[PDB]
A paper describes a structure:
Human endonuclease VIII-like 1 (hNEIL1) is a bifunctional DNA glycosylase of the Fpg/Nei family, which catalyzes the removal of damaged bases and subsequent incision of the newly generated abasic sites. Unlike traditional enzymes which are commonly referred to as highly specific biocatalysts, one special feature for hNEIL1 is its unique capability to recognize a wide range of substrates, including formamidopyrimidines, hydantoin lesions, oxidized, and dihydro-modified pyrimidine bases, derived from all four canonical bases. Here, by integrating structural, computational, and biochemical investigations, we show that hNEIL1 uses a triage mechanism to achieve broad specificity and reduce futile repair of normal bases. This mechanism involves two mutually competing interaction states: an activated state that commits catalysis and BER, and a quarantine state that temporarily separates and prevents the flipped base from catalysis via auto-inhibition.
We next performed simulations for hNEIL1(K242)–dT, which prefers damage recognition using the activated state, to examine whether K242 would differentially influence the recognition of a normal dT. We calculated the relative stability of the two competing interaction states for hNEIL1(K242)–dT. Surprisingly, we found that the two states are of similar stability, hinting that dT is more likely to undergo catalysis in the presence of hNEIL1(K242). This observation from simulation was further supported by a new crystal structure, where we found that hNEIL1 adopts the 242-in conformation and that the thymine base is actually removed by hNEIL1(K242) in crystallo. Furthermore, our biochemical data demonstrate that over the course of 72 h, hNEIL1(K242) is capable of cleaving a significantly higher portion of dT than the edited form R242 (using a duplex DNA containing a mismatched T:C pair). Taken together, these results show that the genomically encoded K242 is faster in damage repair but more prone to error, while the edited R242 is slower but safer. In addition, such pre-catalysis checking mechanism also enabled cells to regulate the repair function of hNEIL1, as demonstrated by the RNA editing event that recodes the key residue at position 242: unedited hNEIL1(K242) is faster but riskier in damage repair, while edited hNEIL1(R242) is slower but safer.
Residue numbers in the entry: 2 to 202, 222 to 290
The structure:
DNA sequence: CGTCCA
DNA sequence: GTCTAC
DNA sequence: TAGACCTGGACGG
């Protein structure tokens, strides 16, 4: 999951929980090495917001819900396989590692953090990760300026395809988005990051770090769209013009992550 | 069955 | 896609 | 900074 998937998850939680009321403990699977979430309430509402590759849940108790309590905020990072699901209480998925339960009247549901590979993390109390830059979806101008102000950082010594994954400067961009963005401009993946951007002190690279993830958000789906699960997959796959597509060049970057591209790999390639 | 990949 | 122990 | 952290699915003999 990258920025778009975090954004769409945030929307899913707000649409799906708008008319729900949760109660009880926040239950966590025995196996999760993540922290227990110390929050019980007889009645409370879950809302969400996204920032790049992070999602913040707020647990907001209702007036007179016992015990008297302030709202609690968690922040989630999805890793490679993190998702939210609203599932009947009796049919929890495999790999449901954090669960919020509906209070009664009506059907016993469960909002689950489902994470097959358990790479996802949650932190108590609400703060975005110190160091992550502005969201490419929701803070374009702050994101765009944060980069152009700091091209003298060592991160931009790296090749462009490597720098595009630096969450200090491209919060929300992941492996598929760097493939899609660089393909749209035909920027060789192993051009020096600084050289590609020095030009910018017809959509440029930084517009596309925003407009391309936004194309994904507006397409919808990706586990959230009320579509048949593997229907969402087909549409997204149809959208991809470069990433793991037949007849595309492919290399490992200095961290051993597959960058996909057309034509010239660029001056700094293994 | 069993590696290779995300 | 980190995150932390090299 | 590069590998350890994980599971299920796709491909192959």
């Amino acid at each position: 999951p990258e920025g778009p998937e975090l954004h769409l998850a945030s929307q899913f939680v707000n649409e799906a929980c708008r008319a729900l009321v949760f109660g009880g403990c926040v239950e966590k699977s025995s196996v999760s090495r993540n922290p227990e979430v110390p929050f019980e309430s007889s009645a409370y509402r879950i809302s969400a917001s996204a920032r790049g590759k992070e999602l913040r849940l707020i647990l907001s108790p209702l007036p007179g819900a016992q015990p008297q309590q302030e709202p609690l905020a968690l922040v989630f990072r999805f890793g490679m396989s993190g998702s939210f699901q609203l599932v009947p209480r009796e049919e929890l998925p495999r790999h449901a590692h954090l669960r919020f339960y509906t209070a009664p009247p009506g059907p016993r549901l469960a909002l689950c953090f489902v994470d097959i590979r358990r790479f996802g993390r949650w932190d108590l109390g609400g703060k975005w990760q110190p160091g992550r830059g502005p969201c490419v979806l929701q803070e374009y101008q702050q994101f765009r300026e944060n980069v152009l102000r700091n091209l003298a950082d060592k991160a931009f010594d790296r090749p462009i395809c490597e720098a595009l994954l630096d969450q200090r400067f491209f919060n929300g961009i992941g492996n598929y988005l760097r493939a899609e963005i660089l393909y749209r401009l035909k920027i060789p993946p192993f051009e020096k990051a600084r050289s590609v951007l020095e030009a910018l002190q017809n959509p440029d690279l930084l517009e596309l770090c925003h407009s391309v993830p936004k194309e994904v958000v507006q397409l919808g789906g990706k586990g959230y769209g009320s579509e048949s699960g593997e229907e969402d997959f087909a549409a997204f796959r149809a959208w991809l013009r470069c990433y793991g597509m037949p007849g595309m060049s492919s290399l490992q970057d200095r961290h051993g992550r597959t960058i996909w591209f057309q034509g010239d790999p660029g001056p700094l390639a293994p």
